[PDB]
Design a binder for this molecule. Structure first.
Ligand code: L5Y
Length: 308
């Protein structure tokens, strides 16, 4: 049967509802509308398998295909962060940028306590997902990463990019999993991060799919195809491109702004639906980052404040 109209209708709708549920936090139809359409698309794909596609909404539920866990080199090494433990540490970081390159805007973000990942896109399609590993070599967990709804299977522009994201289990989901685990005499998960690790380290993606995992995208390997002149702009650019990012990001004009942000999120962290273990602070302008460059270990243009 021709069926192209109904398949495309279902892709339009199921992509629409999945984006509303997992990226926005505002669904537009009940669970039942999404559950009915998805069962229909699965049934079409069962009876008419020529309609199945690499980026179908049905990918989300996991398949028979197993994550290899093969050791795979990142396109570009994933940068590692230097740490700050107080305000003095932060004024030293601010002092040393401003002595070199002058006065800067900062980009402040919540530091997602997750599993760092590389998400490689070819012609706008999700094709490879690796753990961070040693920063240079990771493990291929692609088949499990694909079941995370906050990861687009297809970008709005056909880009050859490798994005970096923090993959995580929402706390509420972590707590109900431990409820289920306690009720079924299974040893409990230690924290959201270990639960998200265990579910990603699955050989079975169907099992990953039933875990309520998400992602926040923080960086990209190459800014050639991006019009962004700053980190703040690159995340807005990532939004328009189809990616899930943290909305709590803030551009501040100075280190008083930086400490003001830390003060807010010390006293607001409790209420978040996800674990954070710090605040990442970056020089916002991209040219200025290039101007600050790197030591042997880390960016000089970025620091992670760690919670006490
Ligand atoms: O544990 C290794 C984390 N590596 C990095 C994470 C983030 C990062 N930026 N924003 C985030 C939010 N949550 C967690 C991590 C990051 N940014 C960098 C960079 F600045 F060097 F590029 C490296």
């Amino acid at each position: 049967a021709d069926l192209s109209s109904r398949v495309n209708e279902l892709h339009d709708l199921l992509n629409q509802y999945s984006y509303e549920y997992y990226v926005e936090d505002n669904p537009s139809v009940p669970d039942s509308e999404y559950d009915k359409l998805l069962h229909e698309l699965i049934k079409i794909e069962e009876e008419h398998p020529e309609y199945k596609t690499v980026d179908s909404p049905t990918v989300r539920v996991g398949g028979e295909a197993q994550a290899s866990f093969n050791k795979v080199n990142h396109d570009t090494p994933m940068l590692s962060l230097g740490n700050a433990f107080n305000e003095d540490d932060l004024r030293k970081f601010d002092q040393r940028i401003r002595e070199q390159i002058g006065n800067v805007e900062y980009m402040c973000e919540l530091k997602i306590d997750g599993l760092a990942v590389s998400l490689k896109y070819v012609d706008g399609y999700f094709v490879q997902g690796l753990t961070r590993g040693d920063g240079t070599t990771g493990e291929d967990i692609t088949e499990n990463l694909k079941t995370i709804h906050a990861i687009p299977l297809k970008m709005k522009e056909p880009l050859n990019v490798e994005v970096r994201g923090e993959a995580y289990m929402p706390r509420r989901s972590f707590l109900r999993l431990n409820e289920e685990k306690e009720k079924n005499d299974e040893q409990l998960f230690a924290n959201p991060r270990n639960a998200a690790a265990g579910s990603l380290r699955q050989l079975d993606s169907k099992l990953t799919a039933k875990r309520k995992l998400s992602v926040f995208i923080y960086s990209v390997n190459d800014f050639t195809d991006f019009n962004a002149r700053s980190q703040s702009e690159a995340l807005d650019e990532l939004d328009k491109l189809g990616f899930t990012t943290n909305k709590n990001r803030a551009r501040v004009n100075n280190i008083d702004g930086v400490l003001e942000y830390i003060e807010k999120w010390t006293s607001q962290r409790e209420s978040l639906p996800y674990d954070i273990d710090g605040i990442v602070i970056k020089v916002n302008d991209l040219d200025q980052q290039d101007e600050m460059g790197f030591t042997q270990k880390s960016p000089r243009w970025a620091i992670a404040y760690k919670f006490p």
